[PDB]
Design a protein around this ligand. Structure first.
Ligand SMILES: [Zn+2]
Ligand SMILES: [Zn+2]
Ligand SMILES: [Zn+2]
Ligand SMILES: [Zn+2]
Ligand SMILES: [Zn+2]
Ligand SMILES: [Zn+2]
Ligand SMILES: [Zn+2]
Ligand SMILES: [Zn+2]
Ligand SMILES: [Zn+2]
Lengths: 360, 351
């Protein structure tokens, strides 16, 4: 038996629970994973009637730590967590998974240009993409959190032609949640009265917090928040500096709240979207009606029936102020894309990307 | 009392958490906010207490909470003053405590922390709800809880708890493993005594899928010598792998501890918790906090379990732990109102 860990080796499916769902998690020994795995195990993410299996992918260097995590899960006695496995080979960890939470990625190293980060992490996702294509479920949902998200996702799906491109996601939910918080604060209202908050573009400094389509208590934010300057200059920067402001305050990563956002991101795919609302997710653009370039992964407004899939939200309004920001982010993504042409199999690479675009 | 966007279904319940900027809290607070602890129909309010030395860390967590958008979390506030943070609180999760300093004798820790809970005990008495449930995690737990309730006379000595649930959960896991059964088939597991190397994992009363453990696990050599030790050294086995504290799992145990108080205990089962022992039926010393088996109707309180058998193997261990507790108690008499203090406590007993 080499597919189970400790006490989890003793289970098997006990045929009102739904069939076991398999979830792979890269960067499994990381800080975000340390907060996320327990939320999943408790059933808060997929619901109380959904038992699950956790396939944790780590590395040779962090395998020890990976064992520590599995042991803490053993001591948590979560009744919905029926299976746990750990490993360093994605062709193994990924077999039969229905979800792939790809958090693993090399941090932006000292004096490491944007291009090198695109190539180093791109290679990692190109391989994980092949692993998923060979051993994972043909309908696996792949949620990318490892930076740079959008382009890593493009690379991943391009290396998994047998998996619908539509199934790949670059998470912008944390930034959506922060934008909504900032909006709520500004309008002096609680965050449960804010909706239709969209983050367009790639997960970087060019991301677009869209206030035009947002609502506060059912009304367009523009009629509630009159301060146009804040909306067009302060809002975005406030969102953009939140992660960085939490670095000096907290001292380190804001793991807890990003794990919360990853959970929300998943729930948005497995629960029907409340009428009129939507959620943000970096997704394959081919076919989009927003006039955005095709063949890339761009965060856009989406809603879901709760079947694990989604559709782009059409009841969206667009003005030049939004359009321009959307095309600017689009351009950065087209530049990133060409820069990884080798990994996508597009042909030959050409890199000319901005250096200070990494969201703090 | 509000923070950030928070400056703007059953009756709201207020929760106070000390050591709020600590690693355990960093996991626990979000479990509480999401509603996995008190349920999806229980809106809550978090009162976060931390040390001034960690106020910035406190802000960070509060900020992460605003960014989490938990709809059940209606209020959040932070501060460094117990008389402030504890006002109207229904629950007080006391995780805050000074770690065993460099070359610090067990007696020093007792005084330093005991002095902290004595003061928090007074703050609770003065401003917290009169029926506030107090769960202690700051070590020493038992002795800190005892000191806390002695300093809060207007609050039922009944409501004070020293958490051992983590050790019970670990015990249940080790029993499930050894018996080749899943951990959800193990029950009636009790951790007796003090939260320390003197704790007593009770296998005599332990059950596995409805039948006594001794009826499934035949390796007696194990039960009698290994079992208790594996549990006792689980925290150490985790620090060698993970690298640091096991915040995540203990946060889960704390959530469980609370749920055993607000959820009807399953028939015939019970949960471990260090509590006031005066009316105890097991013949264990009184006027102290000892971990015993309890059950509850899920109304916030509990009652001891009488459907427990004992033997000399078990009872002897329960006494050695009792001896340690009495020693700790005398050592902090100046904080309980027991007159003068006398310290003759063991050094290496820390889990
Ligand atoms: Zn299975
Ligand atoms: Zn397969
Ligand atoms: Zn990203
Ligand atoms: Zn971000
Ligand atoms: Zn304008
Ligand atoms: Zn106040
Ligand atoms: Zn303790
Ligand atoms: Zn312990
Ligand atoms: Zn006494």
């Amino acid at each position: 038996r080499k597919d189970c860990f400790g006490v989890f080796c003793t289970t098997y499916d006990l045929k009102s629970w739904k069939k076991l769902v398999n979830i792979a998690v890269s960067g499994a020994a990381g800080m975000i994973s340390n907060h996320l795995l327990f939320k999943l195990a408790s059933g808060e993410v997929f619901g109380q009637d959904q038992p699950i299996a956790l396939k944790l992918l780590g590395s040779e260097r962090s395998f020890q730590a990976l064992e520590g995590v599995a042991m803490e899960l053993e001591d948590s006695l979560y009744p919905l967590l029926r299976e746990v496995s750990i490993g360093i080979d994605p062709y193994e960890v990924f077999e039969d998974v229905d979800w792939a939470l790809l958090i693993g990625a090399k941090p932006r190293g000292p004096g490491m240009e944007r291009a090198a980060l695109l190539d180093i992490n791109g290679q990692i996702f190109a391989d994980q993409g092949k692993a998923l294509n060979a051993v994972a479920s043909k309908n696996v949902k792949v949620l990318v959190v490892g930076n740079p998200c959008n382009t890593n996702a493009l690379i991943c799906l391009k290396n998994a032609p047998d998996i619908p491109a539509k199934n790949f996601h670059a998470l912008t939910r944390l930034d959506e949640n922060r934008a909504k918080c900032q909006l709520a604060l500004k309008a002096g209202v609680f965050y449960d009265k804010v909706s239709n908050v969209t983050i367009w573009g790639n997960h970087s400094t060019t991301q677009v917090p869209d206030f035009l389509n947002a609502k506060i208590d059912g009304r367009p934010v523009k009629e509630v928040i009159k301060r146009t300057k804040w909306l067009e200059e302060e809002f975005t920067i406030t969102v953009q500096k939140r992660g960085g402001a939490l670095i000096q305050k907290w001292g380190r990563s804001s793991a807890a709240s990003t794990a919360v956002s990853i959970a929300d991101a998943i729930k948005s795919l497995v629960t029907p979207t409340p009428e009129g609302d939507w959620f943000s997710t970096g997704v394959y653009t081919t076919g989009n009606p927003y006039g955005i370039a095709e063949d890339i992964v761009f965060s856009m407004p989406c809603r879901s029936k709760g079947d694990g899939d989604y559709e782009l939200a059409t009841d969206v309004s667009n003005d030049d102020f939004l359009w321009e920001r959307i095309k600017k982010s689009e351009a950065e993504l087209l530049a990133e894309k060409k820069c990884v042409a080798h990994l996508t199999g597009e042909g030959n690479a050409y890199c000319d990307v901005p250096e200070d675009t990494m969201l703090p």
